[PDB]
Amino acid sequence: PLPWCPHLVAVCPIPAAGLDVTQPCGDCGTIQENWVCLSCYQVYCGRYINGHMLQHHGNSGHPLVLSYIDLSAWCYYCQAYVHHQALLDVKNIAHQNKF
Ligand SMILES: Cn1c(CCC(=O)O)nc2ccccc2c1=O
Ligand SMILES: [Zn+2]
Ligand SMILES: [Zn+2]
Ligand SMILES: [Zn+2]
């Protein structure tokens, strides 16, 4: 992945409620291929399901999303995966919840 991107500034603090990696898509309710938005922590499905996270990006402009499949972070603007220390806390919380 990229070691940095200009949208890391939009990554917001993790809710003290934590993350639920089994949370369904906020629109369609699918349990498959969900992502969590690292700005507002809404959960929506991936491109290969119903594309609700891509829709959320288009309607919010929020840049960076974390996969509940493999804990990768995608930036929609840079069209790349990104990893940086600003993402370690959220990845690690997600990992602890998942495994
Ligand atoms: C990994 N990835 C993703 C991940 C997030 C998603 O599934 O909503 N979204 C894309 C959207 C348009 C074009 C490409 C991608 C892409 O390669
Ligand atoms: Zn959906
Ligand atoms: Zn968002
Ligand atoms: Zn970016």
Tell me the CATH number at 65.
Answer: 3.30.40.10
Ligand nearest to the CA of 54: 1
- How far is the C-alpha of 88 from the C-alpha of 85, rounded, in Å? 5
Domain span including residue 60: 1-99
Strand partners, 19: none
User: 65: CA distance to ligand 1 center in Å?
Assistant: 10
Q: What are the C-alpha distances in Å from 84 to residues 31, 51, 53, 60, 87? A: 27, 25, 21, 23, 6
d(CA 80, CA 77): 8
Resolution of the solved structure (Å): 1.7
List the one residue out of 15, 14, 20 whose CA is nearest residue 90.
14
Residue 26 Cα, ligand 2 centroid: separation in angstroms? Answer: 7
> What's the total number of domains in the chain?
1
Planar angle of CA 87, 56, 37, nearest 5 degrees:
20
Structure-determination technique:
X-ray
